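Our collaborator T.R. sent over the components below with a one-line note: 'Predict the complex.' Nothing else. No constraints on interfaces, no templates requested, no preferences about which chain binds where. So this is a plain run: every listed entity goes in together, and whatever single assembly comes back becomes the starting point for the next discussion.
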Amino acid sequence: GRLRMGFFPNATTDSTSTLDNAIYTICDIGSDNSFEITIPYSFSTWMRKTNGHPIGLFQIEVLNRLTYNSSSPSEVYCIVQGKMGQDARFFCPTGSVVTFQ
Amino acid sequence: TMSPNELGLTSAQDDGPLGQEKPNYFLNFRSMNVDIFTVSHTKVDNLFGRAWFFMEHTFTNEGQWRVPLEFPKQGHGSLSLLFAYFTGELNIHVLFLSERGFLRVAHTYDTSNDRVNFLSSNGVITVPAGEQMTLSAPYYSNKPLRTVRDNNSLGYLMCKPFLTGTSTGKIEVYLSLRCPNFFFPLPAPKVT
Amino acid sequence: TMSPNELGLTSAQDDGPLGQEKPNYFLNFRSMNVDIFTVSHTKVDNLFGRAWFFMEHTFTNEGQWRVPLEFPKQGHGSLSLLFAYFTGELNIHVLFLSERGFLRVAHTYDTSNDRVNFLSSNGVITVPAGEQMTLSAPYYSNKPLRTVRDNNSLGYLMCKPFLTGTSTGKIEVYLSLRCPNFFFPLPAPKVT
Amino acid sequence: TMSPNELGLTSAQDDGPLGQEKPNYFLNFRSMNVDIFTVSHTKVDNLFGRAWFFMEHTFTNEGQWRVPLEFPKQGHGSLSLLFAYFTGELNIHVLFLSERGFLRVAHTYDTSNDRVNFLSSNGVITVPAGEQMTLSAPYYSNKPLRTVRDNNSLGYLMCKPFLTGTSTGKIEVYLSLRCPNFFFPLPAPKVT
Amino acid sequence: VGNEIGGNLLTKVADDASNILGPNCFATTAEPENKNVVQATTTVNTTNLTQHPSAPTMPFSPDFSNVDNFHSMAYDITTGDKNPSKLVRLETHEWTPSWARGYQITHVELPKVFWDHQDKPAYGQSRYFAAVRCGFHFQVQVNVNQGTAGSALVVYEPKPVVTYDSKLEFGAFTNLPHVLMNLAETTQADLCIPYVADTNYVKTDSSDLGQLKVYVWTPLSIPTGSANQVDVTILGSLLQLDFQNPRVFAQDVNIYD
Amino acid sequence: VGNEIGGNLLTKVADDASNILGPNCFATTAEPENKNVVQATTTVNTTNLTQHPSAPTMPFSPDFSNVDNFHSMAYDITTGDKNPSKLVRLETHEWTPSWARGYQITHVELPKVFWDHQDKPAYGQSRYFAAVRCGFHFQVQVNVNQGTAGSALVVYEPKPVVTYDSKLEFGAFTNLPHVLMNLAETTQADLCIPYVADTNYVKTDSSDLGQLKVYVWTPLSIPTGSANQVDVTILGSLLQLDFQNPRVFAQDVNIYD
Amino acid sequence: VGNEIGGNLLTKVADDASNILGPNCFATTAEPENKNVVQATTTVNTTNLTQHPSAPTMPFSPDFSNVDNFHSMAYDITTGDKNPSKLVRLETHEWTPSWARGYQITHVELPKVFWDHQDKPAYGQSRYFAAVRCGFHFQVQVNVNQGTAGSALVVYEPKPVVTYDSKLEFGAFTNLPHVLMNLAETTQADLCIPYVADTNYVKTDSSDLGQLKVYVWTPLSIPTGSANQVDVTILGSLLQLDFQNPRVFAQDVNIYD
RNA sequence: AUUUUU
RNA sequence: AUUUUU
RNA sequence: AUUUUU
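Returned assembly:
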């Protein structure tokens, strides 16, 4: 089956919307079932708050129903990971907003 | 040219060894590295080179102050919790808030509470009343590496104030480290 | 040597792009091209260079004959139905069956029925009574390509006979084309 | 370096052609060929070059002894049963146990029992009483190859003793072969 | 080591047992047309990942130049692309006589005015992007017969100025890109304004990046017989335009913190 | 990029952490013996397609020359092949005395006569093919004692002639490949006839390609005592034979339109 | 021939229909990270076969030398390895006065004595192997004050001797590797014994390979006041050791026929 | 057929 | 350990 | 457009 995951940068309205104009990636199930998606830096500034405005709207819509057979699952599990790009940078160290353990 | 692997199609089970700086692209995009400052604020030496509050002690007598120094789960120093082992110089910043007197300060990685009863050679620097000093304690540890988490990851700090009259006060302590050697990054911490 | 692909084992989903002159062999066999005539009868220029009946009109007055010329779904010209677009010279063969008179013949791709009311510059060739002519109409079309199927794929033909007395007759028309440019072959036609 | 194929991971359906001397290894191991004797005891010429009992016959008259010679399913000669065809010299060892007389010995691959009635040219070597001889019969077979199994795989042996008085006795026979040519090894035999 | 040798273990054997009539058998082994591969295709901000691709197809001896060699459309190939930067009428107000000096004739929301109506060349694209970075080229036109006189102040006011407008002293606005244009002398003013803001990019459909205004330097001195309906028009062109952030159709997105 | 590196990421690591005793581990990665390939084999007019082939096998140090070096069969290796072109007895009729000139002694269906009976060398193959193209070499034999005399006309008649035989003038048949053979002078006639027809190939088991006949040039003049039973025999050999179209066993197939 | 061409049949097409703005599409095809391969790994007497391997992982910029550069353990790196060959106390019996010549003081089961107790350095490994081939270095120590005198015969007796011991003449045992050691002169005897047996290897935990004994050459002549408790000790070291046959933990295995 | 031995 | 800075 | 013919 196929699955299209898009991303609208700095979007705030949490609502399902056509991803035709969003940065999307179509995922066709095969041997390497771990598709990625990159989001280029996008802000009105040369540097943005590490804790402020959202990164954007993340949506993963179904493109083609997950097919199966007598001996295969009718539904599967998915995991979403996140990291920084090779051009990632952090700048000013600030106070803390939470306490770890 | 660009391979499908660098276009997003990969396999999570083929990530080892740890540390793969693989480039990710698509039309109309490429990793763009733009700098705003003349140097990095992500480098361990720079970030940690900046102190952060630790704790405060209110003294009334000439008693001694023994405290297990540890990495913060509170300030920007928390970024250390991402590592497992540490080793290197340790900068201790002490503020002696007192009207008239002196503050003896020392540091050791020795766990024994008797090797400190005297302060012979444990670094007894003197901060006059109302003053503050920044002493850099060397890695005088008996263990090659300091698990970064331990309630005593950093060596113990000693403070025996030498007061003169009924005068009393409080000793605020904050700290940083000089050139830190961190190894074997572990999973990110949880929140309280 | 020969690959299994050229021995019959292939995949229908790997045929694109369209037009793969792949060779097929097996022991004791190889594509043998033997010619019987000095030239090809499959070439578009040759095949279509030969006319084919179109239609007939029986005149009684000096009226005009307007007819939408189109490709045949009947003669060897039907091979054109395998294409979608056409462009090039058009050979029109007209037979003027009359006792005494003249036949004005003209051709245009212009759809307007008024630009023909006069015949000023639409090619008014003259075939005397009982004669026949073959006029080659140029691609004076306002459209770069002529969908090959249209009821007017080919431009309209005009026939205004100039009779003298009560004489009447019939005008049989057949046609071919000079050097034809066909493009984008479409699926084969059905039968009635 | 070493491939996974040579480390044990293989496929039984990819063994043909027959006879693949593939090497097998793993750490701390390698095919080590150490010899104990100056020569091989596995070579067909050597192994079979050594005789083995066949059968015994007790004579009383001057009658003849005809016996279908065949390969043993009993002694070390059984290793021949692993083959299908044979061809080459045949060493026959005969022991003539008699008090006073002579033993005529002959050998032929001819199946006819009448070409032996005389012994004209079938090799009538003479072993005096109480003696023993080893005659090497050539491949005088009418068949290029001798199926190794046949009850007469080896040619027939003839023994017509020439006695003098009432004397009687027994003729023990054992045999080997000189340089044997075996072909097309067949599956191992079963046990009784 | 095996499992493919099917070709030369059959092609050779025959080549070894062949007579004057040649081999009686030929065997060839190779990989299937449908191999185990993965294809990736990327279009504008999109990436299609397929692990079961098939041989791409196309018409006979095709031409993908897509350019009409006959130019049935005589225009520049990049016409549609540059269209949004085209010069357009941003505003047209009437200079009402008896308006004291300093009085604001008319303003214009910059830069969202270029998408003022769905009939603006730039309105189309502007809707699919939340971020904008552009330069301007204004042409304020004011026509007045020779008999009449007067003067207007065409000046560009960045958000900073627009914000604190009342705190600024009129008559000093000449410090900003302006055009004191004396009527009866000039009928049009030209202003080239680059991207000016305290942020790298400005939110599309926002009044940020300032706004262009037209003030009354000296009121209109219209003689008795002379006409009294003077119109002030503001035209705008985009020296350079740049839409970056993708977003849903005309949905308010915050590029700011 | 991964998924195969299992060999040098284990072979090296140990080679990096090895002591005087050498590495404590070796890892090698490669492709399986059973790979994803396709094999194709073609024999005479056949093609076997297998997508799951296996390593072909064969006996120990085998010899596929298939030629008996001892020649237990002393014959030419191509004997069986040429066998069908062998000379054979096609017919044997008796020259009945008192037969006027022009009278037809005997005929022979060409070329289907070479497969006249299942005992004909060519009968075997002829059954597996519908098309034929061949050349002939006839040898009509007629023996007569010296005392007697006479003459016969051995002539080849293509289908055209055989069709319109009655329309042709006898005595002119000498225009066709013939052999006026005068008895008491010649005992055998030789005729080399190439493939003659109005079609490239002739349907197997057909009378097409004409037929060979033997006529009475001049009746037999047999003296009183002389014998009166003269036999005429027709032998045939195929200078060159060619069977092309495959077909079921002896099934009438139409190569013609 | 197809099924992979997805990259250059899409990468080119665009490269053929591209304008000043460059191609509007890029397509690349290749093999998946998870290919059809097989990995094999071999450790000591082990072989792991995997047909579905994955990219091996490891820590950041790792160091597999495994050697502590600070030597927090000051010993030879091969200490643990050689440990089992270490010298050990095999026996210590008391030379009971009034013991006639020829009397056997003490013996020692060779070679199973080196695994005499679970406290023997070699006991560990000896348990995981059934076969052994080694050399010995004995050091029989006997101390006696100067006042006293006497002599003992330290001799090595292979299985052959031990078997037929009573059949051998004492006083001739000097033919075997021995050390007539005269007390009051020598306090220790040294014996280097190589692997001696009628079989290439000896079963671990067996008395084979003989045994070392200590006899009374001449009884102890202990004066009145002198001490009377003389102790004889046997120490053993393995010049060279070799454990080959693998086996369950301390399970009797027969290497012999 | 160094298919006696080197 | 350009593991103060170049 | 050797898209009359060589």
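Summary for T.R.: Chain E has one domain: 1-257.
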